[PDB]
Symmetry: D2
Subunit: 270 residues, 4 copies
């Protein structure tokens, strides 16, 4: 049968692809846009509040040799998502890759979860991603790429006071399986990246909630724990670790990988 795409290194090229990354002003998302751009991608950085950071990222991508632009939209508002895509398409003309990154964390024993906090998390983490995914489908080029952001907590077995957040990410893994069927009519592949503890603002904010008796841990102590307890490779994961895998899925190399959950932890067990 016919070979799908070029043979050799040329199959990993993202040059000439237009990508949209939600929540790209900081954290993993910022690095996702940065790296995508470094591999020759035109990046559209979406943001909700971090305008400054957003703009800063856009400047950076250009400085690196790629074109970029930023769009504002609150993924928790379906109308904002609908608008974000209508503008996105006009900016560079087409849309090849979509990275649904935006998300929020939450901690608390089941007995203390309020309907307000449950809806807060699920609305961004689960509902937002579905509608971003829905719009991505409509605007993606035939053969496009949809990448959903999940988490190690979707399958973790030992994280206490973490049902709401874990459930929101767990549902994303199921979305991938089902969306991979529907979206295949446009040759779009759908996959879920499931990171496991990356140094970002979030990490700084809630890492201690994962460490048994960690209220006291100093920043370096947290990293020491993370590095040793969570990976045989003995090191803390960085956004670039996710960004690299995301580029693989987005390239020709990931053409036969669809409906899957790629766990990107250093071999962690949570």
């Amino acid at each position: 049968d016919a070979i799908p795409g070029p043979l050799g290194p040329q199959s990993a090229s993202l040059e000439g692809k237009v990508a949209l990354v939600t929540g790209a002003g900081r954290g993993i998302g910022r690095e996702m846009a940065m790296e995508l751009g470094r591999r020759g991608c035109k990046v559209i950085v979406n943001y909700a509040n971090s305008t400054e950071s957003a703009e800063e990222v856009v400047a950076a991508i250009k400085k690196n040799g790629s074109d970029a632009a930023c769009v504002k939209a609150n993924v928790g508002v379906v109308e904002d998502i609908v608008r974000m895509f209508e503008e996105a398409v006009k900016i560079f003309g087409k849309l090849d890759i979509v990275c649904s990154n935006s998300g929020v964390v939450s901690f608390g024993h089941v007995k203390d979860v309020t309907p307000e906090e449950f809806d807060r998390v699920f609305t961004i983490n689960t509902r937002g991603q579905f509608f971003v995914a829905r719009e991505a489908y409509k605007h993606l080029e035939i053969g496009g790429r949809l990448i959903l952001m999940g988490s190690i907590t979707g399958q973790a077995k030992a994280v206490p006071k973490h049902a709401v957040y874990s459930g929101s990410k767990g549902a994303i893994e199921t979305f991938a399986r089902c969306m991979a069927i529907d979206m295949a009519d446009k040759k779009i592949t759908v996959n879920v990246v499931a990171p496991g503890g990356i140094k970002t603002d979030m990490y700084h904010a809630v890492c201690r909630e994962y460490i048994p008796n960690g209220e006291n841990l100093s920043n370096e102590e947290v990293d020491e724990y993370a590095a040793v307890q969570w990976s045989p490779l003995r090191r803390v994961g960085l956004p670039i670790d996710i960004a690299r895998v995301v580029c693989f899925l987005a390239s020709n190399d990931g053409g036969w990988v669809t409906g899957k959950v790629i766990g990107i932890d250093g071999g962690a067990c949570m």
Copy 2:
């Protein structure tokens, strides 16, 4: 170490246990309450609309030798759930087992899902179960049992136009893992039963949506397909098939089974 519970058949006894089953007026739930009662349980049948059916079930359980009562509550309304448990506890004095059964189906290509239909399904299937689970925790006896209703679609790989429903059930499997940690402080075990196509009203309504080119299938033809394509055991699953496993988890036998997903299909592959 000390043996947990009696040795012998006495370990499967549900006699003297009070159970609450949501959506017990029909389908799998009705049979869940019926069977639980047959094993000596006092059943509280919850219902949303099927009052007649509800009452009918209560009469049946008594006729079989057990006490029962019914409570009305819409699981999509947190206040209703809160009330349902406050009344439940007063009826028979205590609450040992809770079976979160209620749920709704949905079909449609991703591109046609509306925010209204997404919220419709997630609100009952996922959000409702969380709050039923939350209240169950607060009112369950030390050593109680919480059983969540999932589905084969949470892990299925070939069902098209089924992302919303599949995602709502998928999140339930994650809830089980996390809730099993928090709720363990009261010795409560949390598990998810994941049926795979049971003859109920739902089955009559949407089975054809699972069968490639099944609009034409006659009722008997659907059952023939179900029996042959979905199980090496060559037969259609019945509510009693789930009801029996639910009794196992609810008994002393299921004391060391927690945080798990029990797939109850005839060895189906979807």
Copy 3:
């Protein structure tokens, strides 16, 4: 459709069933035969070396009110398995349940595994179980039950120096999926129980190999670790914990549970 089996507690009855348990002279297996007998089963206890213990168990089952007999066979020798079943059938006339329990542990960094030690473990743990399963098929009554012994290590993510043993148990989970299809022509259900640290001779021998820096731990200290680190339920698992689940699968209640892996840990994460 027709209801499969009796409604009510009578569905959990094992009375009048003949079962064969391999490696039933001690550990989990001994308790499996004991409990099966307590629920009205005629047990055939197989053994390899523990004759004394074997006979002792047979005396016990009778003293409890059930008939039993013991057969000697080395599961690592296919001819022994073939013979064991030919004799087994003649003893009580038929064979309803088979519990493939026998197994051996092993520890060591990959770099130190010798072909001899690899074959030692795989020959009993994997190859033995396949041939026990093969013979069980041929001799089981239509509607019989085949239960394979697996382990938490089949899916564990953090146990070092444990590839050979973990791999032997992992393959058992796959055997269950496939055997459930072939063996279904005789209505036999095939399932895998996956315990997670049970107090038996094995536990006494190698538990410390699972505890980071545990050479020094005293017996009570090991149990303290096991109870706290491996279960939210805060207690060490006992053979009776597995024995109870095995009876469920062997009864009418487990009729619709086939091709599955039932994890029997206190919600452990390894």
Copy 4:
């Protein structure tokens, strides 16, 4: 923290890496060596019987601009594996990547499996891979890559008469989890690629055994079935599909992916 490796496309470069691929004279393996070479790798093609094909591949890689050499060894013989690595290291001086590809298929109802045919498959598929993995550890450069060959059958739910082969591949997934811990002391990442039906000699030989009533299917009919039934993407998988993912895992991009099973099917459900 410090960024692991270069930022940008340079992270996907395999230039200057020495790789060893077992069973590289034909099928997926041949393409694995070819592609690895195209990305600037020095490939050592191992073979068992296909000398001609082996040599042909070596000529090809050189013609493409990379150096290659071939080594003969029967993975079912531990002494051969030990020798293969001692020679391998001397050829190009070092060893960065190892791809354990070699394998054999088998079909048959459980009841017809003979100890000879069970050992035949397990000895190459499971035992061989363990010892190849063991030797890879000893000779791999710090930061090396070990990639094990698995299959969709390790998790498949509907393939009949396939327990022996499925079990041999299933154990490989467990090996990955455990080996990822031990081998991490040398910064080596261990992962399992799990293809799902690739056009190779094997495919030509046994594809019909997967298709219900396929004895009659013509070659083109088989491909039609494969393309439609096994993938929403509607096409048959090719060796290049696996080869591309293998290059990702072998590069810097796969540095944080370890202890995982990458399913490389077109979203197949078996």
